Write an enzyme that holds these catalytic residues in place. Structure first.
Site, PDB file in Angstrom:
ATOM      1  N   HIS A   1       0.751  -1.177  -0.045  1.00 38.65           N
ATOM      2  CA  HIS A   1      -0.009   0.052   0.109  1.00 38.65           C
ATOM      3  C   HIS A   1       0.847   1.127  -0.028  1.00 38.65           C
ATOM      4  O   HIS A   1       0.702   1.930   1.115  1.00 38.65           O
ATOM      5  CB  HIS A   1      -1.012   0.018   1.155  1.00 38.65           C
ATOM      6  CG  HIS A   1      -2.113  -0.787   1.111  1.00 38.65           C
ATOM      7  ND1 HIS A   1      -2.041  -2.118   1.620  1.00 38.65           N
ATOM      8  CD2 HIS A   1      -3.241  -0.810   0.350  1.00 38.65           C
ATOM      9  CE1 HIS A   1      -3.179  -2.839   1.400  1.00 38.65           C
ATOM     10  NE2 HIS A   1      -4.126  -2.155   0.632  1.00 38.65           N
TER      11      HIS A   1
ATOM     12  N   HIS B   1       1.398   1.906  -5.500  1.00 38.30           N
ATOM     13  CA  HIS B   1       0.079   1.468  -5.722  1.00 38.30           C
ATOM     14  C   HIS B   1      -0.797   2.476  -6.099  1.00 38.30           C
ATOM     15  O   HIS B   1      -1.740   2.506  -6.592  1.00 38.30           O
ATOM     16  CB  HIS B   1      -0.247   0.659  -4.400  1.00 38.30           C
ATOM     17  CG  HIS B   1      -1.710   0.479  -3.869  1.00 38.30           C
ATOM     18  ND1 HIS B   1      -2.357  -0.403  -4.694  1.00 38.30           N
ATOM     19  CD2 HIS B   1      -2.519   1.361  -3.113  1.00 38.30           C
ATOM     20  CE1 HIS B   1      -3.720  -0.523  -4.559  1.00 38.30           C
ATOM     21  NE2 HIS B   1      -3.765   0.437  -3.453  1.00 38.30           N
TER      22      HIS B   1
ATOM     23  N   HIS C   1      -5.884   7.593  -2.014  1.00 36.64           N
ATOM     24  CA  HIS C   1      -6.893   6.957  -1.569  1.00 36.64           C
ATOM     25  C   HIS C   1      -6.411   5.773  -0.339  1.00 36.64           C
ATOM     26  O   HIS C   1      -7.213   5.017   0.286  1.00 36.64           O
ATOM     27  CB  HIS C   1      -7.633   6.018  -2.490  1.00 36.64           C
ATOM     28  CG  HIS C   1      -7.086   4.772  -2.894  1.00 36.64           C
ATOM     29  ND1 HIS C   1      -6.024   4.496  -3.849  1.00 36.64           N
ATOM     30  CD2 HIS C   1      -7.161   3.382  -2.494  1.00 36.64           C
ATOM     31  CE1 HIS C   1      -5.618   3.516  -4.019  1.00 36.64           C
ATOM     32  NE2 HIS C   1      -6.268   2.599  -3.114  1.00 36.64           N
ATOM     33  N   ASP C   2      -5.178   5.722  -0.289  1.00 37.07           N
ATOM     34  CA  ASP C   2      -4.445   4.692   0.706  1.00 37.07           C
ATOM     35  C   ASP C   2      -3.353   5.573   1.676  1.00 37.07           C
ATOM     36  O   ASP C   2      -2.634   4.900   1.976  1.00 37.07           O
ATOM     37  CB  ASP C   2      -3.947   3.522   0.208  1.00 37.07           C
ATOM     38  CG  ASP C   2      -4.881   2.412  -0.136  1.00 37.07           C
ATOM     39  OD1 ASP C   2      -6.004   2.005   0.740  1.00 37.07           O
ATOM     40  OD2 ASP C   2      -4.900   1.845  -1.262  1.00 37.07           O
TER      41      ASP C   2
ATOM     42  N   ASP D   1      -8.629  -0.036  -7.531  1.00 36.28           N
ATOM     43  CA  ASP D   1      -8.054  -0.770  -6.451  1.00 36.28           C
ATOM     44  C   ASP D   1      -7.221  -2.033  -6.576  1.00 36.28           C
ATOM     45  O   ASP D   1      -6.159  -2.368  -6.500  1.00 36.28           O
ATOM     46  CB  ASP D   1      -8.832  -0.557  -5.283  1.00 36.28           C
ATOM     47  CG  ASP D   1      -7.727  -0.446  -3.675  1.00 36.28           C
ATOM     48  OD1 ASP D   1      -6.711   0.206  -4.004  1.00 36.28           O
ATOM     49  OD2 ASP D   1      -8.485  -0.601  -2.803  1.00 36.28           O
TER      50      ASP D   1
ATOM     51  N   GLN E   1      -5.937 -16.876  -4.282  1.00 42.79           N
ATOM     52  CA  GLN E   1      -6.342 -16.078  -5.374  1.00 42.79           C
ATOM     53  C   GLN E   1      -7.305 -16.690  -6.108  1.00 42.79           C
ATOM     54  O   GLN E   1      -8.011 -15.963  -6.841  1.00 42.79           O
ATOM     55  CB  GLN E   1      -4.774 -16.257  -6.155  1.00 42.79           C
ATOM     56  CG  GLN E   1      -3.610 -15.614  -5.811  1.00 42.79           C
ATOM     57  CD  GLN E   1      -4.006 -13.813  -5.451  1.00 42.79           C
ATOM     58  OE1 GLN E   1      -4.395 -13.328  -6.177  1.00 42.79           O
ATOM     59  NE2 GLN E   1      -4.023 -13.557  -3.975  1.00 42.79           N
TER      60      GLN E   1
HETATM   61  C1  LIG Z   1      -6.842  -6.998  -1.347  1.00 45.80           C
HETATM   62  C2  LIG Z   1      -6.396  -7.695  -2.496  1.00 45.80           C
HETATM   63  N1  LIG Z   1      -6.303  -7.101  -3.869  1.00 45.80           N
HETATM   64  C3  LIG Z   1      -5.620  -7.710  -4.850  1.00 45.80           C
HETATM   65  C4  LIG Z   1      -5.461  -9.018  -4.593  1.00 45.80           C
HETATM   66  C5  LIG Z   1      -4.982  -9.938  -5.961  1.00 45.80           C
HETATM   67  N2  LIG Z   1      -5.708  -9.614  -3.501  1.00 45.80           N
HETATM   68  N3  LIG Z   1      -5.364 -10.973  -3.160  1.00 45.80           N
HETATM   69  C6  LIG Z   1      -5.614 -11.059  -1.861  1.00 45.80           C
HETATM   70  C7  LIG Z   1      -5.436 -12.244  -1.041  1.00 45.80           C
HETATM   71  C8  LIG Z   1      -6.812 -13.057  -1.574  1.00 45.80           C
HETATM   72  C9  LIG Z   1      -6.736 -14.177  -0.598  1.00 45.80           C
HETATM   73  N4  LIG Z   1      -5.782 -15.129  -0.205  1.00 45.80           N
HETATM   74  C10 LIG Z   1      -6.407 -16.155   0.674  1.00 45.80           C
HETATM   75  C11 LIG Z   1      -5.507 -17.048   1.253  1.00 45.80           C
HETATM   76  C12 LIG Z   1      -4.143 -17.030   1.125  1.00 45.80           C
HETATM   77  C13 LIG Z   1      -3.701 -18.262   1.641  1.00 45.80           C
HETATM   78  C14 LIG Z   1      -4.530 -19.157   2.283  1.00 45.80           C
HETATM   79  N5  LIG Z   1      -5.904 -18.934   2.569  1.00 45.80           N
HETATM   80  C15 LIG Z   1      -6.424 -18.086   1.914  1.00 45.80           C
HETATM   81  C16 LIG Z   1      -7.848 -17.945   2.133  1.00 45.80           C
HETATM   82  C17 LIG Z   1      -8.441 -16.638   1.526  1.00 45.80           C
HETATM   83  C18 LIG Z   1      -7.724 -15.929   0.717  1.00 45.80           C
HETATM   84  N6  LIG Z   1      -7.977 -14.716  -0.044  1.00 45.80           N
HETATM   85  C19 LIG Z   1      -9.193 -14.179  -0.278  1.00 45.80           C
HETATM   86  N7  LIG Z   1      -6.252  -9.842  -1.707  1.00 45.80           N
HETATM   87  C20 LIG Z   1      -6.019  -9.025  -2.427  1.00 45.80           C
HETATM   88 MG   LIG Z   2      -7.332   1.001   1.093  1.00 41.87          MG
HETATM   89 ZN   LIG Z   3      -5.812   0.712  -2.251  1.00 43.34          ZN
END
Ligand SMILES: Cc1ncc(C)n2nc(CCc3nc4c5cccnc5ccc4n3C)nc12
Ligand SMILES: [Mg+2]
Ligand SMILES: [Zn+2]
Ligand SMILES: Cc1ncc(C)n2nc(CCc3nc4c5cccnc5ccc4n3C)nc12
Ligand SMILES: [Mg+2]
Ligand SMILES: [Zn+2]
Lengths: 317, 322
Positions: free
Chosen positions: B78, B82, B116-117, B227, B279
């Site tokens: 962040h 970004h 925004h961040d 975002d 992912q």
């Molecule tokens: C806030 C944000 N923005 C962009 C992106 C590509 N991402 N990817 C994430 C993480 C998504 C995610 N990772 C897990 C996860 C990872 C390891 C083990 N268990 C998990 C369970 C749920 C997850 N999520 C939703 N947050 C974001």
């Molecule tokens: Mg934010």
């Molecule tokens: Zn952001």
């Protein structure tokens, strides 16, 4: 002892007297001249009366013997790296001490001596005698060991007009310089210098700050094919993969799986592999180098140009 | 707040875009990564090409930009990169929908995105709350987001940093409301509310853009597509940025473990193995539905959906051994 007699005689053609000073010179189509090109770069940058031609020539041809017919880590790559350090030093002519300038051109030219076309990983997993010997930075330490060995041969010792210290000094510059081309150490190196440039504690009167800058300069040179003009650049990557895949194949032959980078079956992911490598390694390297030494900027601009080219390959332009 | 030094905005002014970027900056999948020195200058180029060359007085803009930069931390995800990345995406959405939006929304949406961040500590809306933080005492829904905007105003109010100098008091209180709403809607906890209604408003042919509360809804979703747009870049960029997202999360998970408490998997480095499925799960639950509804409303934005699909397949491949 007639190889190094046909080297004393070389005159670099006038048409290359400018082309060579450019960061993006491609030594590629000048095969015959490569040892004369290096003689030229040493003279221009260190002096005609600092190494006694013969001993210099003796050295160079021997170094040349000691590079194998591998697809990438070869005599062509020594010179190319040496060349890039020439361009770095020429454009920064004041910062570096007489003793460093000589060390670094030498250190560049031997930096991959007697490479076998195998990564350190490979050497270590299969308990090869060089891994047995050097647990870390395996190939890099041999390279240095091999620099030491060529120098101690009769009449090859080009540092024979120097103090005790002055001799143990330069070799040390070379030691640290060759070690630094182990890319696993580059990441650390670069992160320290970044924090030191932001903070501002970066001091070139500090010899261990000097070490890190020289360190980074070695990576920049080692990686310098990503700064050439795109056709050179495109082509020289083919040579890289040819080294890797022959190491990948050798692993299959052992019922063991190589990583994708080393898996010729994976030819297709090559462009995305490059783009990944430029963003994670190349660009930050040339970026921080430029921060530290502003005149090195055409290195970064050309790196950006090739990154685009790799993008276009991936996207189909 | 923190003043920015003199020399910072003076070079920013002299800065000129290279003729080859002018071409690539208009494109959706453009990655700003390899031009760090150029970022604050990429913002100007972007502002000017969207909101005009005398929209703001360069001097005031440049001060603001550099002071926006310095109020970002060296946290892993962040950060200053970004912010510009999110601004770039807005820019490319605006440009492809240029007259759908008032001159006044495009100024404010591009700044909002830049800001925004602001001053992100490196922590989630859950941490700060759970551990009864000041910030959590101050703001109790959309915590950091509210703080992000508090932070914008603070930067607005600084001798020379006010770029809405020459605005009517009326328009001044408007661009501040575009910005507020835009920033809060980056609170991802809200996106799910927003997307359902928009999706509903879509299936009935009842979404209307001159209907203000539908406008704000659309704007908020633009703020979400921005975002998350790292999932719309070419694969090796997407993966590398994923590394940085996780670096930040796991840094937070490490703090919880210290504090006597067990992080959710996403924040627990010991759970890396499930990264691909996290992912895969995020592309299907969050991102794909983001760009699908965005492309239904603003069809020129479609390249964002296509690239999101591209990287959804990559995580799927990553998954099956390959
Ligand atoms: C806030 C944000 N923005 C962009 C992106 C590509 N991402 N990817 C994430 C993480 C998504 C995610 N990772 C897990 C996860 C990872 C390891 C083990 N268990 C998990 C369970 C749920 C997850 N999520 C939703 N947050 C974001
Ligand atoms: Mg934010
Ligand atoms: Zn952001
Ligand atoms: C050490 C070095 N110097 C220069 C250059 C231009 N390169 N390029 C590389 C390899 C970069 C790379 N390629 C892949 C890759 C290729 C196809 C399939 N999978 C891959 C996985 C990782 C790769 N990396 C790091 N190393 C170097
Ligand atoms: Mg090497
Ligand atoms: Zn090398």
């Amino acid at each position: 002892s007639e190889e190094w007699q046909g080297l004393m005689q070389f005159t670099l053609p006038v048409r290359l007297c400018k082309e060579i000073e450019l960061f993006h010179f491609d030594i590629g189509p000048f095969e015959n001249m490569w040892p004369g090109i290096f003689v030229y770069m040493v003279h221009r940058s260190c002096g005609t009366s600092c190494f006694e031609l013969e001993k210099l020539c003796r050295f160079i041809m021997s170094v040349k013997k000691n590079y194998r017919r591998v697809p990438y880590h070869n005599w062509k790559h020594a010179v190319t790296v040496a060349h890039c350090m020439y361009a770095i030093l020429q454009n920064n002519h004041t910062l570096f001490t007489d003793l460093e300038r000589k060390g670094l051109l030498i250190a560049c030219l031997c930096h991959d001596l007697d490479h076998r076309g195998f990564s350190n990983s490979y050497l270590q997993k299969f308990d090869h005698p060089l891994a047995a010997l050097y647990s870390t930075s395996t190939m890099e330490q041999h390279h240095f060991s091999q620099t030491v060995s060529i120098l101690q041969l009769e009449g090859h010792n080009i540092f024979s007009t120097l103090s005790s210290s002055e001799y143990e000094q330069v070799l040390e510059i070379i030691r640290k310089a060759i070690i630094a081309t182990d890319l696993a150490l580059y990441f650390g190196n670069r992160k320290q210098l970044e924090e030191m440039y932001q903070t501002g504690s970066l001091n070139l009167n500090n010899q261990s700050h000097r070490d890190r800058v020289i360190g980074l300069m070695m990576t920049a040179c080692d990686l310098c094919s990503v700064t050439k003009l795109w056709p050179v650049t495109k082509l020289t990557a083919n040579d890289i993969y040819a080294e890797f895949w022959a190491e990948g194949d050798e692993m299959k032959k052992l019922g063991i799986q190589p990583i994708p980078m080393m898996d010729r079956d994976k030819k297709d992911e090559v462009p995305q592999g490059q783009l990944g490598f430029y963003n994670a390694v190349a660009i930050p390297c040339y970026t921080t180098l430029t921060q530290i030494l502003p005149p090195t900027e055409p290195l970064l601009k050309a790196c950006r140009d090739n990154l685009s080219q790799w993008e276009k390959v991936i996207r189909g332009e």
